[PDB]
Ligand binder design. Sequence first.
Ligand SMILES: [Cl-]
Ligand SMILES: [Cl-]
Ligand code: NA
Ligand code: NA
Ligand code: NA
Lengths: 250, 249
Amino acid sequence: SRKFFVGGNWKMNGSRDDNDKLLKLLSEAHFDDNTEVLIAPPSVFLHEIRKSLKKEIHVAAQNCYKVSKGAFTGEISPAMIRDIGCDWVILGHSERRNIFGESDELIAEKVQHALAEGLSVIACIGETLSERESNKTEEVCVRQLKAIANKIKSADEWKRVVVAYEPVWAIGTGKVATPQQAQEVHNFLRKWFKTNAPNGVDEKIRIIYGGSVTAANCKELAQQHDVDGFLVGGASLKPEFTEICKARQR
Amino acid sequence: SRKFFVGGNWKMNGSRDDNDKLLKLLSEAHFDDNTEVLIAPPSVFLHEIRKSLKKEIHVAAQNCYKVSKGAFTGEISPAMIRDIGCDWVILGHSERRNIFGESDELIAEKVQHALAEGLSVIACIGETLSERESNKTEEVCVRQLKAIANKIKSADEWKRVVVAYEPVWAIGTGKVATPQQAQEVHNFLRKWFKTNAPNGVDEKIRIIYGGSVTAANCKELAQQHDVDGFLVGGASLKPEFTEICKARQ
Ligand SMILES: [Cl-]
Ligand SMILES: [Cl-]
Ligand code: NA
Ligand code: NA
Ligand code: NA
């Protein structure tokens, strides 16, 4: 059975005093062996947070670039992420795709490079409100996923990928996908893997939901057949995050 | 008189081992009191490098965004840069403009925000080979500078700005600008500041040159009347960086 997976995307939020309070709450929570837990702080805090935080909790960069070093002022590399002792990265987040213009191919290139360095990847996909209204949800999701899958050449590589489906219109808007909306997307996503990725990957790959997940709505979403966890944004800065990590419990 | 200013832009280069060997040579060197020195490591190394390095050497983030917090996955804010104890940021670098498509206006919004947060800012401008060959150098530099100046409303803000002129065709190409080409742009920029910034900014603002600066070419550039220093890229990873910092001598 796929291990349940809850990541917390802090986005552009953090400071020594705020981080210390949040990490104190995280360290004191008790997470069962059945739940895999990840936080993603801003890049300037990654090294110190990884040093102090227990190793059962992942510490991810929120973005990285697609080569180990070079003339890319402002960018960090998977080698740099490994050098500071972190093992994960979020790639293709909608804010990077939309506000910063990162293309499908750029995300695919980043994912392939991160996997080549030994990282695990949360690879983000999703459709806008207008794309959904035009009944393009699957077309858009499958385009973004296919670009990434085209650079993943073996089934072993897919073991270090978690797919996050986040409808753009649910991100930070308070407007979560209904449990039926989420299950329906994740189901055709898993079917796409069954058809298009190496045998067996469909049954192992975690597909997590993101977009206005809170403690008030996380339990019904977690009971959905093809939902394997969450990418939590605004709520990952609050005490209720530890409650969202228990989403599968009664 | 304006203090000589030398910055090292590491770009996307850095690791605990490589950083340690670099900072040792840098922490052992001796610079005269009229030289201001700055390094700019990748964001993941900023905090620990700032903690261990003598305060007189600045440590700059290589980029930041234009508000203090929000839903901008992968970005960092002036407030975070200050929280980890750094007081500088490079904004508007050629690589952000020409690889990541940062517009003049986005750059100007960033500078205004970093300045309002109390940071000091290296603001980069410069023209392409095509632009230079169309005799568009001054028009391009002014367009870029003017977007920033529009958001800056005080000599006090301009006090914490260092302008880096970096011809795009000189960055990483081995084609440095001659002392004469550099001086010609720097003199024109200082003239533009006299009319387009509050009184006295032109006399104060450091205009530093960037683009294939090496220990082999820096002294002649440093002698030009309006060149106040250097933004150094590839050579800033090498021991000869400390020589470039001594270019006025
Ligand atoms: Cl980790
Ligand atoms: Cl500093
Ligand atoms: Na640790
Ligand atoms: Na198959
Ligand atoms: Na004036």
